[PDB]
Design a protein around this ligand. Structure first.
Ligand SMILES: *[C@@H]1O[C@H](CO)[C@@H](O[C@@H]2O[C@H](CO)[C@@H](O[C@@H]3O[C@H](CO)[C@@H](O)[C@H](O)[C@@H]3O)[C@H](O)[C@H]2NC(C)=O)[C@H](O)[C@H]1NC(C)=O
Ligand SMILES: *[C@@H]1O[C@H](CO)[C@@H](O[C@H]2O[C@H](CO)[C@@H](O)[C@H](O)[C@H]2NC(C)=O)[C@H](O)[C@H]1NC(C)=O
Ligand SMILES: *[C@@H]1O[C@H](CO)[C@@H](O)[C@H](O)[C@H]1NC(C)=O
Ligand SMILES: *[C@@H]1O[C@H](CO)[C@@H](O)[C@H](O)[C@H]1NC(C)=O
Length: 319
């Protein structure tokens, strides 16, 4: 031989000076690329007179960054800790990442940026809204609260609360929206005709105060017996006293609440406003029976025109 040929390309290295052929006596140098390393340092060779480059034992491998697989209270995502890999971080519920959430292993074999740590999310003590009191509240980390902890507010007597009464410690370290407590008033409730109404002996009625209604015999409420002063300044309802109905026939089987009853029994004392029943009517043609409805409305009940009073449409087969 008279010249050495182009030197072989080894895995993660560079050769210098890189030429396609060399005169015996010229020198080349193999180095690992930045970020890799090899047992034995760099290797130098002189082209020999035979024109054959000698055996190259250079073996370049990536620098390894210090072990970073364990993040207290969190998780690390990774494949290997070698140049030039990246590792990412995240924290368990309740903690926040104090630092960068990703890091790369550098040419120098250091992590960049520096590795983070997880830390507990906390909220300082909540502030108490204007006309309220703090019912349910207890610190769980020094004088502060932990993530998802809660505090519960209760308004002062005569005040209505607007917005949830419960707050939670969030991840941004503050609590969720606070509620407000305004005082609310209701006008006195009106006495219903044929009835009476009762309510506390105060000169003024506030939120949550209650009134109860009653009727004189022969009448009944067409609403709830008890009513409340609501947060919007009006009452939950204003029932009135409606007239009862005398039973409209002397004897008859009717359907009352999907069930047969003898009208003059079930309604011994009259039918209340609202009460609905179904009379039985006979279809002379098909010799069977159907029912028409009727309802007591403030003292009147219209008995279906087809109804006949006492062989009993009640005892005839259905259509
Ligand atoms: C608790 O603290 C967090 C974090 O600072 C607060 O969240 C921040 O809320 C503001 C407004 O709600 C966000 O800014 C911008 O406001 C405009 C309003 O003109 C809105 O149109 C935009 O969409 C945007 O939200 C800000 O980005 C947001 N910050 C974060 C990190 O989410 C939160 O308000 C605080 N909670 C309470 C109850 O004070
Ligand atoms: C109490 O007063 C409020 C005040 O208006 C009544 O009306 C509110 O509720 C209605 C429900 O059907 C809504 O249609 C109205 O938009 C709403 N009014 C306002 C100003 O928000 C409310 O119904 C009253 N409640 C009762 C039981 O009578
Ligand atoms: C709790 O708060 C008080 C101040 O009222 C303070 O003196 C004390 O050191 C705090 N405790 C902790 C654990 O931070
Ligand atoms: C507040 O009330 C809402 C009603 O929609 C309820 O779903 C929620 O659980 C309450 N707030 C909190 C923090 O629980």
């Amino acid at each position: 031989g008279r010249t050495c040929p182009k030197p072989d390309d080894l895995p993660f290295s560079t050769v210098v000076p890189l030429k396609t052929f060399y005169e015996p006596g010229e020198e080349i140098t193999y180095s690992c690329k930045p970020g890799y390393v090899s047992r034995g340092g760099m290797r130098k060779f002189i082209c020999p007179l035979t024109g054959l480059w000698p055996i190259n034992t250079l073996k370049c491998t990536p620098r390894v960054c210090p072990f970073a697989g364990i993040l207290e209270n969190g998780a690390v995502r990774y494949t290997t800790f070698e140049y030039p890999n990246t590792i990412s971080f995240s924290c368990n519920t309740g903690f926040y990442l104090n630092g960068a959430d990703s890091a790369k292993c550098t040419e120098e074999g250091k992590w960049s940026p520096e590795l983070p740590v997880c830390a507990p999310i906390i909220c300082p003590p909540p502030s108490i809204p204007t006309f309220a009191t703090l019912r349910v509240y207890k610190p769980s980390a020094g004088n502060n609260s932990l993530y998802r902890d809660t505090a519960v507010f209760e308004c002062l007597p005569q005040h209505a609360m607007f917005g949830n009464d419960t707050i939670t410690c969030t991840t941004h370290g503050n609590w969720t929206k606070l509620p407000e407590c305004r005082e609310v008033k209701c006008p006195f409730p009106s006495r219903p005709d044929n009835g009476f109404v009762n309510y506390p002996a105060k000169p003024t009625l506030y939120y949550k105060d209650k009134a109860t209604f009653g009727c004189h015999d022969g009448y009944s409420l067409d609403g709830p017996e008890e009513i409340e002063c609501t947060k919007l300044g009006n009452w939950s309802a204003m029932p009135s006293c409606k007239a009862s109905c005398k039973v409209p026939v002397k004897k008859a089987t009717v359907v009352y609440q999907g069930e047969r009853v003898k009208i003059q029994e079930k309604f011994k004392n009259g039918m209340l406003h609202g009460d609905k029943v179904s009379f039985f009517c006979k279809n002379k043609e098909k010799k069977c029976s159907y029912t028409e409805d009727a309802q007591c409305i403030d003292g009147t009940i219209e008995v279906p025109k087809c109804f006949k009073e006492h062989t009993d449409a009640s005892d005839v087969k259905p259509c």
